[PDB]
Amino acid sequence: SMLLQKTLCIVKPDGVRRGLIGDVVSRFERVGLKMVAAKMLIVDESLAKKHYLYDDIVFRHSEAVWNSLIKFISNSPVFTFVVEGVESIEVVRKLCGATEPKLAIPGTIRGDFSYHSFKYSNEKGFSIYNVIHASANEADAMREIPIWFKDNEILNYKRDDECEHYYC
Amino acid sequence: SMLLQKTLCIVKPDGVRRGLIGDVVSRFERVGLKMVAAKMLIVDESLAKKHYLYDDIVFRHSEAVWNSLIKFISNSPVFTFVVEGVESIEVVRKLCGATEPKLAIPGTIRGDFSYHSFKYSNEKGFSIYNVIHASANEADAMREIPIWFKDNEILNYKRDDECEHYYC
Amino acid sequence: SMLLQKTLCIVKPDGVRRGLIGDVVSRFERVGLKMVAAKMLIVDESLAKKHYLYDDIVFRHSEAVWNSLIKFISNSPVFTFVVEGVESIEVVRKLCGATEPKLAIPGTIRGDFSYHSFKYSNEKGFSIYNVIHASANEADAMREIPIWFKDNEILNYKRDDECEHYYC
Amino acid sequence: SMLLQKTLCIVKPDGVRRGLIGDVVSRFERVGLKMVAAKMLIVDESLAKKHYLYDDIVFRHSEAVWNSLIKFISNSPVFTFVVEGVESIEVVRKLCGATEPKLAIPGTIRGDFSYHSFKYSNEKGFSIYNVIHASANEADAMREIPIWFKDNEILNYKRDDECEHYYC
Amino acid sequence: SMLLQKTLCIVKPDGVRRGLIGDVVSRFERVGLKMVAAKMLIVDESLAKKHYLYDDIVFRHSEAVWNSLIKFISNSPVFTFVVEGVESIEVVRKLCGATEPKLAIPGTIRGDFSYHSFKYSNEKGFSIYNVIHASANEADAMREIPIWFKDNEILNYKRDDECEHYYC
Amino acid sequence: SMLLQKTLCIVKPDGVRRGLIGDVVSRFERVGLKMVAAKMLIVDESLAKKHYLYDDIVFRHSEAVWNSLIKFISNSPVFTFVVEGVESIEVVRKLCGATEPKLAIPGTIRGDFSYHSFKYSNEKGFSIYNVIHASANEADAMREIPIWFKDNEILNYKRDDECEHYYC
Ligand SMILES: Nc1ncnc2c1ncn2[C@@H]1O[C@H](COP(=O)(O)OP(=O)(O)O)[C@@H](O)[C@H]1O
Ligand SMILES: Nc1ncnc2c1ncn2[C@@H]1O[C@H](COP(=O)(O)OP(=O)(O)O)[C@@H](O)[C@H]1O
Ligand SMILES: Nc1ncnc2c1ncn2[C@@H]1O[C@H](COP(=O)(O)OP(=O)(O)O)[C@@H](O)[C@H]1O
Ligand code: VO4
Ligand code: VO4
Ligand code: VO4
C-alpha cells in the first residue's frame, strides 16, 4: 500500500540532555507506529547543513533562524529514528504538536515536555528548543531519511500488533 | 438527579488483544467516573447485530461498513462496561476522541492508542479499529445498556471520592 | 502443556472504591498475562462465605479473621477476573506482594497501593484492606474460579503477544 | 528578561483530599516549569475572601457563586505554590485547561482529573471542583502571590535543565 | 491509636533540581499516606546543622559524612513535608529504599530515581545524592518535625480514602 | 575515575516486537544513567554467535540452549545501546532483574514486562524471552561493546543532571 509511509524523527540535543528519549519513543510505540531505524550520533556542522537546507529555511523564516538552528544541532548529541505506519507522516506531526512549545497542546510531545516561546527565542538569539524533529511531509521524509540513514539500516519486521493496524 | 447518566462502553477486540483494558478503565476512574458493571465475552453474531443496528449504520455509512463492523466484533473478545457520572455520556465521548484514529486528538484514548485512517480502512475493506466504543447519546445509552447487561448487573455503590464529583 | 494455568483474582471493595481497577488490570496485562474472564458484582453473604470458607480460614488463621473478611466483602462491590498464563498462579502472587500492605515490597500491587498493618487491623477489629485477592495455589484456583464464573464465561482467544510468552 | 514570570497555583481541597498533589506538581515540572515556592495550609475564611474578591466574582458570575467558592475553600486544606518560567502564566493556564471540567480537554490537569458540569453545580448549589487554581493573567498573578507568600518564601535557584528553557 | 505516626520527609536539592518533587509526593499519596505539612526553602547552614546532628552522624558514621551532608544541603533548595499514617515511619522508609542508590531496590524512590555509590561519593568527597530524606525511627521523627515545622503548620483533615486505611 | 563504566544493553526481539523500546530506555534515563550509543539492526548469524559464544553458553548451560538462543536472536530485530555511569554494569543488572522472568522481582524490567519460566522454555525447546540483555560484568562489557559498536559510535556528552550523579 502507498499509504504506508516512513517518516524521519530526531530527538534533538535538548531532548537527549534532558533524558527524554524513552518518553519520546514510547509515544510512537504506544499508538501503534513502528520503529524501523535508529542511531545516536554527534551532529557535525556538515550534516546539520544537509538536514536544514539554507535555501529552505531563509525563504520560510530568516537567516538568523537558520544560523541558530545549525548552532543548536552542530556538535551536539541527537537520537535519530525512522517511524513506519499508515499515513505516519501526518500522524507523527499530530503527536509532536505545534512547533512552538508555548502553543503546543497538552498531550503532545512538545506540549507535555517543553513550554518556552518564539518571542523568547527571538529575544535571546537562540533556536526554539522543542524536543523533537519530524518530517513535515512526504517530500521532506523522502529527502531527510537518506541524509541520516543508509538503505540497509531501515529494517523490515512485524510488530506483534501488526494485524490491528495494517489488518491481516 | 437526571444529570447523572449511565453510558455503555466496550473495549473492542483490538483493545483486548493489545492488552489495553487496564489503560482504558484507568482513563475513566482517573477523571472520577465510576464503573458500575463489567463483563468479558466472546460476541456472537446475533449480539453483534443487536448492538450495531443495520438501519443505523447503513443510513449513516454504508452496508459495507456494517458488514465490516459485524465481522470485526463477531466471534471476538470484548470487555464491556457501564460508566456512571454527571453528564457521563458526553464526558466519556470526549475522553474517547474522534472515530478516526488518524484524527483523534492526543490525550484522548483513540488518539493515544491507535492511529490508522478511514482511507486505509476503505482501501483494505476492514472496519476501523479504534480501541473503544461509547454510547453516542442518551437514547443510544438507553438502548445499548440492556442489550449487554441485565438490570441486576448494574451496581449501586459509592466511590470514595463521591463528595468531590456528586457533592455531599 | 501442564504449566498453563488459570487463577482467580478479585479487586476487593477498597480497590474498587479507590478507583484502582484499571491500575490492577494493567499490572497483569503488562507482564503478558491474559484476562480471560471478568465481572463486577455486589457480593452477598453466601457468596462471600463460599469464597472464604469458614474451615479454611479458621484453620489457616482464626474465627475473628473469618468474621472480619466476611464483613469487608459482603454487600460490597468487587471486580473479579481470571488471569491465564505460564505458571500464572505463582506469577500473580509475586505481582500482588505479601498479604500485609506494611511489608509488601514496593513494585508489587500491595506495596504500591496500600500500607496499613496487621497490628492495626487487629487493634481496630477490621480485615486488612489489601486491594486484591488471588488464588493461593492450584487447588484454590480450581475451587475459586467456578464459584465466580460459569464455564461459558471463561474466554478462549489469542493475545497479539502470544508468541512471546507461549511461543509459536 | 521581561518574559520571565511567576504565577500562583493552588491544588484546591478536592485535589488535596483526592491525593493529587504529586500529579499536579509533576505536570509543571515535566514541561520545564520551576517550583519556586510551596506551602500547605488550612485556609480560613478571612484569607479565602482576600483571594476570591467579592466585587470581581459577583460582576463576572453572581453572589451565589462567590459564597460557594468561599464555602468550598474555607477551613479546608490547600497546597499552594508558585511557578516561574518563560511566559509561565499563559503556559500554566493551557496546562490547567478550561474552568469547567466537563469541557476541559484531555491532556490538561482539569481534563484528566475531574469531569462535572456547571449545570450540575448550579443544580446542587456548590462551587465547581476543578482541582487547581492558577492566576489568569499578569495582574492577577501580581495580586495573588503576596496574598499567599511572603517575599522571603519565593526561592531563587537553578533547575538542572535551565539551559534548555532559559538558554545559557 | 498509638500506631498513627507522623514522619519528616525532605526532597533533597538533587531531587528538587532534577524536577522530581511531584514524583516523590505521588509515591506517598498513592499508597494512602497523607501529606499533613509542606514548605519549600533554601536551607541555611545553621538549620542544616540542627537537622544533621554532629554527635548523631559522627557516632553513626564519621566527621567526613556529617560535613558532606551539611555542604550538600546548605544554601540549597529543599521541599520538606510531613507524612501521616499507620506506622508511617517504617512504611515511608520501605518506600524510599536503601540509603545507597546503587543498592536501593527497583520500585523504591531511590532505586527508580538515583543510582550512584558510597564508593564513588567517598572517592569524590561529596555526600550521596539519594533524592529524599525520611526519619529513621520514632525518636528521630519527634526531634526532626519541630525543627522544620511549627505546630500550627501540621494540618488536620481527612483524605477521601481514609476509611480504607484508618477504617471508619 | 575508575568507577565510571560503560555497559552493553540489548532490547531483544520480543521487546522490540512488543513495542517496549521506549519503556526500557526510560528506566535507565530515569535513574540518571546516560545513553551513549544506539542502533537498531537485524542480527545476522555470525554476530549472534559472536555475542553468544558457544563455549561460554555450553559451559554455563548446554548446546540446546545455545542453539535456541541463536534462533531467537538471528534474523530478528534488536535495539542495542550502551549505557554509561558510576558502577553502571552492576546497576543496569539490578534494573534488569533475574534472568528468569517468572522470578524477576516486580520493579525490574523483566519483572514488570515478562513472566514465563525456564521450565516452560525447556519444555518447548525455545530460549527464555526476557526483553533485555545486559553485560554481566566488566570483562563481559569490554568484550561486548566493540562487537556491536565502533569506537566512533560511542558518544561523549554531558547530561543536564550530570552534577547530581558524577558531581561537579
Ligand atoms: N467509514 C468507516 N470505515 C470503516 N469503519 C468505520 C467507518 N465509520 C465507522 N466505522 C467503525 O464503526 C464504528 C461505529 O461507527 P460510528 O458509530 O459512526 O462511530 P463511533 O463509534 O465513534 O460513534 C466506529 O467506532 C468504527 O469502528
Ligand atoms: N458558574 C459557576 N458555578 C460554580 N463554580 C464556579 C462557576 N464559575 C466559576 N466557578 C468556580 O470559581 C472559580 C473561579 O472562577 P473563574 O476565575 O471564572 O475560573 P478559573 O478558576 O478557571 O479562573 C473556578 O475555578 C471555579 O471553581
Ligand atoms: N535455561 C535456559 N533456557 C532457555 N534460555 C535461556 C536459559 N538460560 C539463559 N537463556 C537465555 O540466554 C540468555 C543468556 O543467558 P545468561 O547469560 O545465563 O543470562 P543473562 O542474559 O541474564 O546474562 C538469557 O538472557 C536468556 O535469553
Ligand atoms: O526540526 V522541525 O522541521 O520538526 O521544527
Ligand atoms: O483475599 V486472599 O485469599 O489473596 O489473602
Ligand atoms: O538523609 V536521611 O539519610 O538520614 O534518610
PDB file of N, CA and C in Angstrom, chain D residues 7-35:
ATOM      1  N   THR D   7       3.743  32.716  38.679  1.00  0.00           N
ATOM      2  CA  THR D   7       2.295  32.535  38.743  1.00  0.00           C
ATOM      3  C   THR D   7       1.882  31.738  39.999  1.00  0.00           C
ATOM      4  N   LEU D   8       0.776  32.146  40.602  1.00  0.00           N
ATOM      5  CA  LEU D   8       0.271  31.440  41.767  1.00  0.00           C
ATOM      6  C   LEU D   8      -0.630  30.289  41.363  1.00  0.00           C
ATOM      7  N   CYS D   9      -0.338  29.119  41.937  1.00  0.00           N
ATOM      8  CA  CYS D   9      -1.142  27.913  41.784  1.00  0.00           C
ATOM      9  C   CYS D   9      -1.641  27.432  43.133  1.00  0.00           C
ATOM     10  N   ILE D  10      -2.848  26.870  43.149  1.00  0.00           N
ATOM     11  CA  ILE D  10      -3.407  26.198  44.329  1.00  0.00           C
ATOM     12  C   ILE D  10      -4.020  24.850  43.937  1.00  0.00           C
ATOM     13  N   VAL D  11      -3.517  23.756  44.520  1.00  0.00           N
ATOM     14  CA  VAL D  11      -4.228  22.497  44.482  1.00  0.00           C
ATOM     15  C   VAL D  11      -5.348  22.673  45.500  1.00  0.00           C
ATOM     16  N   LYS D  12      -6.569  22.778  44.981  1.00  0.00           N
ATOM     17  CA  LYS D  12      -7.777  23.011  45.770  1.00  0.00           C
ATOM     18  C   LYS D  12      -8.107  21.816  46.684  1.00  0.00           C
ATOM     19  N   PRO D  13      -9.009  22.016  47.668  1.00  0.00           N
ATOM     20  CA  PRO D  13      -9.318  20.973  48.653  1.00  0.00           C
ATOM     21  C   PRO D  13      -9.698  19.629  48.044  1.00  0.00           C
ATOM     22  N   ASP D  14     -10.359  19.642  46.878  1.00  0.00           N
ATOM     23  CA  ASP D  14     -10.690  18.403  46.154  1.00  0.00           C
ATOM     24  C   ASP D  14      -9.431  17.668  45.736  1.00  0.00           C
ATOM     25  N   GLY D  15      -8.446  18.404  45.207  1.00  0.00           N
ATOM     26  CA  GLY D  15      -7.191  17.805  44.760  1.00  0.00           C
ATOM     27  C   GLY D  15      -6.429  17.210  45.928  1.00  0.00           C
ATOM     28  N   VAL D  16      -6.356  17.967  47.019  1.00  0.00           N
ATOM     29  CA  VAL D  16      -5.682  17.521  48.220  1.00  0.00           C
ATOM     30  C   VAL D  16      -6.358  16.268  48.770  1.00  0.00           C
ATOM     31  N   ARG D  17      -7.678  16.338  48.978  1.00  0.00           N
ATOM     32  CA  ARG D  17      -8.431  15.206  49.555  1.00  0.00           C
ATOM     33  C   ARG D  17      -8.395  13.946  48.681  1.00  0.00           C
ATOM     34  N   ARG D  18      -8.162  14.129  47.375  1.00  0.00           N
ATOM     35  CA  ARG D  18      -8.154  13.021  46.402  1.00  0.00           C
ATOM     36  C   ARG D  18      -6.746  12.504  46.142  1.00  0.00           C
ATOM     37  N   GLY D  19      -5.771  13.130  46.804  1.00  0.00           N
ATOM     38  CA  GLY D  19      -4.372  12.713  46.738  1.00  0.00           C
ATOM     39  C   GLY D  19      -3.717  12.998  45.407  1.00  0.00           C
ATOM     40  N   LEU D  20      -3.981  14.176  44.844  1.00  0.00           N
ATOM     41  CA  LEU D  20      -3.499  14.523  43.505  1.00  0.00           C
ATOM     42  C   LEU D  20      -2.384  15.579  43.488  1.00  0.00           C
ATOM     43  N   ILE D  21      -1.776  15.862  44.641  1.00  0.00           N
ATOM     44  CA  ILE D  21      -0.785  16.928  44.730  1.00  0.00           C
ATOM     45  C   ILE D  21       0.419  16.606  43.835  1.00  0.00           C
ATOM     46  N   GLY D  22       0.988  15.424  44.052  1.00  0.00           N
ATOM     47  CA  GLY D  22       2.094  14.927  43.244  1.00  0.00           C
ATOM     48  C   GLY D  22       1.811  15.007  41.749  1.00  0.00           C
ATOM     49  N   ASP D  23       0.658  14.476  41.323  1.00  0.00           N
ATOM     50  CA  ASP D  23       0.241  14.531  39.903  1.00  0.00           C
ATOM     51  C   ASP D  23       0.269  15.953  39.345  1.00  0.00           C
ATOM     52  N   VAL D  24      -0.304  16.898  40.094  1.00  0.00           N
ATOM     53  CA  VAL D  24      -0.390  18.291  39.637  1.00  0.00           C
ATOM     54  C   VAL D  24       1.018  18.888  39.512  1.00  0.00           C
ATOM     55  N   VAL D  25       1.839  18.700  40.545  1.00  0.00           N
ATOM     56  CA  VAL D  25       3.226  19.200  40.542  1.00  0.00           C
ATOM     57  C   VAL D  25       4.080  18.614  39.383  1.00  0.00           C
ATOM     58  N   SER D  26       3.997  17.309  39.150  1.00  0.00           N
ATOM     59  CA  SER D  26       4.723  16.687  38.037  1.00  0.00           C
ATOM     60  C   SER D  26       4.385  17.291  36.675  1.00  0.00           C
ATOM     61  N   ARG D  27       3.125  17.667  36.456  1.00  0.00           N
ATOM     62  CA  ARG D  27       2.720  18.239  35.163  1.00  0.00           C
ATOM     63  C   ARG D  27       3.574  19.463  34.827  1.00  0.00           C
ATOM     64  N   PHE D  28       3.846  20.275  35.840  1.00  0.00           N
ATOM     65  CA  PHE D  28       4.586  21.516  35.647  1.00  0.00           C
ATOM     66  C   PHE D  28       6.087  21.284  35.613  1.00  0.00           C
ATOM     67  N   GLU D  29       6.575  20.409  36.484  1.00  0.00           N
ATOM     68  CA  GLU D  29       7.987  20.042  36.483  1.00  0.00           C
ATOM     69  C   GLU D  29       8.376  19.426  35.139  1.00  0.00           C
ATOM     70  N   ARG D  30       7.502  18.560  34.621  1.00  0.00           N
ATOM     71  CA  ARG D  30       7.769  17.811  33.396  1.00  0.00           C
ATOM     72  C   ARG D  30       7.930  18.713  32.164  1.00  0.00           C
ATOM     73  N   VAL D  31       7.114  19.769  32.026  1.00  0.00           N
ATOM     74  CA  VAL D  31       7.248  20.682  30.867  1.00  0.00           C
ATOM     75  C   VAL D  31       8.475  21.570  30.949  1.00  0.00           C
ATOM     76  N   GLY D  32       9.038  21.688  32.148  1.00  0.00           N
ATOM     77  CA  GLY D  32      10.221  22.520  32.348  1.00  0.00           C
ATOM     78  C   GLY D  32       9.998  23.693  33.277  1.00  0.00           C
ATOM     79  N   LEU D  33       8.770  23.835  33.759  1.00  0.00           N
ATOM     80  CA  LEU D  33       8.467  24.904  34.694  1.00  0.00           C
ATOM     81  C   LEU D  33       9.073  24.610  36.065  1.00  0.00           C
ATOM     82  N   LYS D  34       9.375  25.681  36.796  1.00  0.00           N
ATOM     83  CA  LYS D  34      10.119  25.598  38.044  1.00  0.00           C
ATOM     84  C   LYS D  34       9.252  25.971  39.253  1.00  0.00           C
ATOM     85  N   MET D  35       9.196  25.094  40.257  1.00  0.00           N
ATOM     86  CA  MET D  35       8.549  25.456  41.519  1.00  0.00           C
ATOM     87  C   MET D  35       9.487  26.331  42.360  1.00  0.00           C
TER      88      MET D  35
END
